[PDB]
Ligand binder design. Structure first.
Ligand SMILES: [K+]
Ligand SMILES: [Mg+2]
Ligand SMILES: [Mg+2]
Ligand SMILES: [Mg+2]
Ligand SMILES: [Mg+2]
Ligand SMILES: [Mg+2]
Ligand SMILES: [Mg+2]
Ligand SMILES: [Mg+2]
Ligand SMILES: [Mg+2]
Length: 92
RNA sequence: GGAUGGCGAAAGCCAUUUCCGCAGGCCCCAUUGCACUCCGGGGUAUUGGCGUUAGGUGGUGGUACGAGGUUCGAAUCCUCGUACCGCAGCCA
């Protein structure tokens, strides 16, 4: 557990189309602090996972302790910090 | 794409097709995966469109050619249109 600007989320319902997932994720997470970006992919290795990048590490960390396990589409979210800064954060 | 026919030396472009295929509907298998350019696979439906970067309307930049205007005349500047290309969305 090494605090990062980006929370990593897996165990997401894989049926949900992309656009919808982002929309829903943004509604739930944008209320923990300002969000800079949400990355969703439905590649063989990326599906079921989502990368939410807050603007301040204090937000990401708060979202984590709070949304951990939260129902989402009949599936508990499993959240963690992202093993590595996100492209936009690092350049900055 | 294959085949067949048309102009061609090919490139290509056109056409046809109860050959194969693509996006869109609907099901099924597989994946618990730490990424930032994308990207598993299969069955069935399969009109129309397209042809592996594989559908469409209208829209924004571009490339191409055309028209009107600019001008003495323009290959310049201006706008309009069309074909295509990367693009966002929406629809299939
Ligand atoms: K045919
Ligand atoms: Mg052929
Ligand atoms: Mg021929
Ligand atoms: Mg001939
Ligand atoms: Mg041909
Ligand atoms: Mg299909
Ligand atoms: Mg298929
Ligand atoms: Mg002229
Ligand atoms: Mg004149």
């Amino acid at each position: 557990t090494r605090p990062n600007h980006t929370i990593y989320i897996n165990n997401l319902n894989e049926k949900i189309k992309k656009d919808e997932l982002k929309k829903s994720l943004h509604a739930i997470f944008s209320r923990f602090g300002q969000i800079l970006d949400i990355l969703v992919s439905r590649s063989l290795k990326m599906r079921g996972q989502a990368f939410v990048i807050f603007k301040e590490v204090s937000s990401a960390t708060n979202a984590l302790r709070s949304m951990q396990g939260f129902p989402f589409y009949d599936k508990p979210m499993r959240i963690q910090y992202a093993k590595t800064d996100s492209d936009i954060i690092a350049k900055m």
